[PDB]
Amino acid sequence: SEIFTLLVEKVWNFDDLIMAINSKISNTHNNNISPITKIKYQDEDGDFVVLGSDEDWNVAKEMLAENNEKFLNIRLY
């Protein structure tokens, strides 16, 4: 349910994206290790798709770059 909004600066190698997610989410010292590893991502604030292996993210980065879109949303459920 919880929605998160993030924009992929300098094309993250996923780890950068995860770390950025945690940087935003509870920067203090809560679940700032891994976002439940159930990260789900949305693009152009319109479509929702979920990743885990460094492959779906490859599709997303290419999508963002090719589409020109950069808005990304992250769902935890």
Curated annotation (Swiss-Prot):
The name this protein goes by in its record: Cell division control protein 24
Assembly mode: Interacts with AXL2.
Further comment found in the protein's record: Present with 1010 molecules/cell in log phase SD medium.
Domain of life: Eukaryota
Range covered out of full length: 778 to 854 of 854
Role, per record: Promotes the exchange of CDC42-bound GDP by GTP. Controls the polarity of calmodulin, and the calcium regulatory process of bud emergence. CDC24 may be involved in the initial selection and organization of the budding site.
Domain PB1: from-to ranges: 1-77
